[PDB]
Amino acid sequence: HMERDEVGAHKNAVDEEIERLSQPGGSEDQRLNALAERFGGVLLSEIYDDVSLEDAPYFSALYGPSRHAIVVPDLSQVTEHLEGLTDCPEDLYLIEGDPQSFDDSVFSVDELEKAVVVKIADRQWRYSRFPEVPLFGRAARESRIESLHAEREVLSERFATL
Amino acid sequence: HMERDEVGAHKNAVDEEIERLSQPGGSEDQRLNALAERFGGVLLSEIYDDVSLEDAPYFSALYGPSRHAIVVPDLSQVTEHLEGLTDCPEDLYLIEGDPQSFDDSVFSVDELEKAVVVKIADRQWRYSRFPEVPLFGRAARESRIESLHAEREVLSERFATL
Structure with a gap:
């Protein structure tokens, strides 16, 4: 379980930065x-x-x-x-x-x-x-946001796969 | 009629400055x-x-x-x-x-x-x-507005008496 949960943990951290970076x-x-x-x-x-x-x-x-x-x-x-x-x-x-x-x-x-x-x-x-x-x-923030989003998705799928 | 109308005219002029000075x-x-x-x-x-x-x-x-x-x-x-x-x-x-x-x-x-x-x-x-x-x-503008307002009222009253 420690592996599976470490993935979820990393996915939450990624979401948090995304949230931070996406404020108006x-x-x-x-x-x-x-x-x-x-x-x-x-x-x-x-x-x-x-x-x-x-x-x-x-x-x-x-x-x-x-x-x-x-x-x-x-x-x-x-x-x-x-x-x-x-x-x-x-x-x-x-x-x-x-x-x-x-x-x-x-x-x-x-x-x-x-x-x-x-x-x-x-x-x-x-x-x-x-x-x-x-x-x-702004450009760097945007790229970062998109990259983090791509990673988020890979981790979301990995997690679901258990 | 020229007197009465000059009063109206001066009145409108005052009104206009009040308007300007009153914008937020x-x-x-x-x-x-x-x-x-x-x-x-x-x-x-x-x-x-x-x-x-x-x-x-x-x-x-x-x-x-x-x-x-x-x-x-x-x-x-x-x-x-x-x-x-x-x-x-x-x-x-x-x-x-x-x-x-x-x-x-x-x-x-x-x-x-x-x-x-x-x-x-x-x-x-x-x-x-x-x-x-x-x-x-701001303070000087506020006083100007009030004074102009007081003047406006005297002229409106004068006008009404013709």
């Missing part, structure tokens, strides 16, 4: 996508598609609100699109870089218990706790 | 209030209670996300309150200063068509359009 959140303003396209840029959330499940929470918190940044080649030519822009979030972030070879912003940071503390300026801190559902690593 | 928004995370109290600080929101109707839009946008900041006496002394803090927004801002004689943050900014563009860092821009309902100036 790590959402983005619906308008950011079109905006990125209309600016000729790529969302930072899409660039950090593959951030590991291990790093996603820390990095999403680290970036602060700039996590929703649209990355484009040159800011100078974005101006064109900003002048008169109103149909966008009250705070829109634009970062200059290469979507294909992007360099992480550098932050003055200290870590805490599943949280981060960024020094924005002198006598100005930003406390960003780790999100349950990080904005980054 | 300039909202703030409901949890921020208790935390400000728990950290022994005061929300920037409250400190900038009386920002003129003229300056509120521009000023609210300028601050970016830091607009929801909790101002406290000494940052290093809040640390203890942040350790393990999870029931708060994913990004919590804390500014060290004196609520009664608070000094503004210094921003590197350029203005646009009712919007601001703050340089967060090299190759990093924040575009913040003016809010219809700014976070700051």
